[PDB]
Amino acid sequence: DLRLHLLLNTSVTCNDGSPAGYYLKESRGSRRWLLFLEGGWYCFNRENCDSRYDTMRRLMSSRDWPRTRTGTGILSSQPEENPYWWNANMVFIPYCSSDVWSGASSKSEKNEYAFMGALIIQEVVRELLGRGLSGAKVLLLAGSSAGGTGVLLNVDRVAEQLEKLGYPAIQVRGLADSGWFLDNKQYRHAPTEAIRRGIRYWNGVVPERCRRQFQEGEEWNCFFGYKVYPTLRSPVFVVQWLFDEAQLTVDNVHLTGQPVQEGLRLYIQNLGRELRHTLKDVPASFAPACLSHEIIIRSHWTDVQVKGTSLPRALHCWDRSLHKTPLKGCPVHLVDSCPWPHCNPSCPT
Numbered sequence: 266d267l268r269l270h271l272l273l274n275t276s277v278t279c280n281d282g283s284p285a286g287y288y289l290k291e292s293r294g295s296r297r298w299l300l301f302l303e304g305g306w307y308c309f310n311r312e313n314c315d316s317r318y319d320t321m322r323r324l325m326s327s328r329d330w331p332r333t334r335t336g337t338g339i340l341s342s343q344p345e346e347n348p349y350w351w352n353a354n355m356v357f358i359p360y361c362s363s364d365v366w367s368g369a370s371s372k373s374e375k376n377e378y379a380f381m382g383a384l385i386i387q388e389v390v391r392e393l394l395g396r397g398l399s400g401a402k403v404l405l406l407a408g409s410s411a412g413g414t415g416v417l418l419n420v421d422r423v424a425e426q427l428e429k430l431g432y433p434a435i436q437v438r439g440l441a442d443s444g445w446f447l448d449n450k451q452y453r454h455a456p457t458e459a460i461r462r463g464i465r466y467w468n469g470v471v472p473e474r475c476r477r478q479f480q481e482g483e484e485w486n487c488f489f490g491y492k493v494y495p496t497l498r499s500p501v502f503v504v505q506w507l508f509d510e511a512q513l514t515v516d517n518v519h520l521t522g523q524p525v526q527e528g529l530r531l532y533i534q535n536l537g538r539e540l541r542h543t544l545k546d547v548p549a550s551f552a553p554a555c556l557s558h559e560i561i562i563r564s565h566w567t568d569v570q571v572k573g574t575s576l577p578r579a580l581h582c583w584d585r586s587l588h589k590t591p592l593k594g595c596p597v598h599l600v601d602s603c604p605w606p607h608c609n610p611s612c613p614t
């Protein structure tokens with residue numbers, strides 16, 4: 266089990282002002298540290314945040330968090346479940362800021378809620394340095410869904426923070442799962458306006474090089490992986506289903522009824538091709554042709570393969586590449602080319 270620690274700086278808070286925190290399982294024999302960001306959509310105004318507070322309160326408060334959590338998938342310490350990093354120091358950071366990990370605003374006379382996701386990451390890192398992170402060789406910042414987008418928004422900030430704090434030997438890297446979206450046309454009737462809204466409501470922050478490209482008012486562009494990834498300096502591995510369920514949800518597509526007619530067939534096929542295209546210059550990536558959502562903390566995450574190679578293998582190959590020339594039999598760029606959901610036999614059932 267991973268054990269809860271509430272932040273010692275109690276001014277870094279969840280939405281309702283309760284302290285943020287992290288769950289930790291130490292591995293004294295290891296210099297590898299894995300910090301995972303939870304997901305779970307977001308809220309963008311007073312009224313829909315109030316709704317979230319009544320029926321999704323664990324994503325807005327620490328309030329009712331349990332003392333322990335079980336590490337699963339990439340957070341498992343068992344080699345049978347986690348071939349990649351079973352011996353690492355494990356950290357799960359709960360998502361209680363509802364801001365896609367981008368916010369830097371406190372509760373105040375003006376603000377009913379605090380949106381502090383970017384500062385929560387900062388403070389977890391600072392407090393872990395006294396608990397063994399000071400001796401790390403690699404810090405892998407990982408996350409799923411909103412946490413995957415959060416990796417893209419925060420990985421270079423963590424690298425800069427450690428450089429500033431006097432720890433230049435820690436190699437910061439990112440693993441973004443299910444956070445690589447396309448700002449495409451919807452299948453039926455704008456969705457980017459909510460991001461737009463949210464950034465203003467949260468005082469949201471984006472990576473500086475991306476901000477300098479798009480400039481005031483256009484920071485929403487940096488929430489889209491294919492636009493923000495080229496501005497990042499830390500190594501980032503991208504995991505994305507070609508037919509992601511959150512992408513299809515915001516596109517107003519519901520693949521439940523049996524008959525799919527020509528217009529929807531072409532829409533689905535074009536979406537997969539466009540995603541494939543955005544990953545073509547991403548050398549570390551894993552993109553299976555499946556209809557699903559999230560991948561890395563589920564217990565059977567080892568089952569899926571692209572061109573015969575599993576995700577835990579691909580991640581191991583990525584480690585070797587970061588010790589340039591590709592490696593014999595140990596690939597790192599794995600993107601399906603078949604054009605329909607579940608044309609890969611290994612997709613989750």
Ligand SMILES: OCc1ccc(-n2cnc3ccccc32)cc1
Pocket residue numbers: 306307308459514515
């Ligand atoms: O599963 C139903 C379903 C429908 C829509 C959405 N959704 C779309 N954009 C969003 C922005 C913020 C929060 C939820 C959002 C989620 C879930």
Ligand SMILES: OCc1ccc(-n2cnc3ccccc32)cc1
Pocket residue numbers: 306307308309313314316317321459
């Ligand atoms: O968790 C808060 C929360 C906010 C918004 C929603 N939501 C529901 N239907 C939507 C359609 C478009 C955008 C957002 C939507 C659900 C949940």
Ligand SMILES: OCc1ccc(-n2cnc3ccccc32)cc1
Pocket residue numbers: 365414446447448449450451456457459460488489512515516
């Ligand atoms: O135009 C398609 C379309 C896809 C995704 C979204 N989207 C909504 N909330 C988001 C948060 C982070 C990244 C993308 C997000 C909007 C539009």
Ligand SMILES: *[C@@H]1O[C@H](CO)[C@@H](O)[C@H](O)[C@H]1NC(C)=O
Pocket residue numbers: 274276277384
């Ligand atoms: C707590 O964190 C806040 C927000 O980052 C910061 O302003 C403050 O300096 C911190 N407090 C202490 C005592 O370090």
